[PDB]
Amino acid sequence: SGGNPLEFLRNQPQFQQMRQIIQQNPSLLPALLQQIGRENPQLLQQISQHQEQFIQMLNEPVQEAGGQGGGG
């Protein structure tokens, strides 16, 4: 996928959803932050340590859509 820690998420379809909501509603960022912990506590550790790298992942264009109506 790449080299950066959270950069591997670029291929992870589960994370693709996390970024989708952020494309339209970045306010759901803190909602997904805790969510990462319920699905991948190990990943969350990397998220909190390298948030800056994870944030940019959220903001990149994702093949899903980038809009949500009830997610987070």
Q: Which CATH number covers residue 45?
A: 1.10.10.540
Structural domain of residue 28, as residue ranges? 6-59
Asked if residue 70 belongs to a domain, the reply is: no
Closest CA to 19 of 53, 56, 47, 69: 56
Asked if residue 66 belongs to a domain, the reply is: no
Give Cβ neighbours of residue 54 (< 8 Å, ≥ 6 apart).
6, 9, 46, 47
Q: To the nearest 10°, the Cα dihedral for 27, 31, 33, 39?
A: -140
Asked if residue 34 belongs to a domain, the reply is: yes
Q: How many domains does the chain have?
A: 1
Asked if residue 30 belongs to a domain, the reply is: yes
Distance CA 47, CA 22 (A): 15
Residue 44 phi/psi, 5° resolution?
Answer: -55, -35
Distance CA 40, CA 62 (A): 20
**Elucidated via:** NMR
* 3-state percent helix, strand, coil for the chain, nearest multiple of 5: 70, 0, 30
Asked if residue 46 belongs to a domain, the reply is: yes
Asked if residue 69 belongs to a domain, the reply is: no
Distance CA 51, CA 29 (A): 11
Asked if residue 24 belongs to a domain, the reply is: yes
**Residue 3 identity (one-letter amino acid):** G
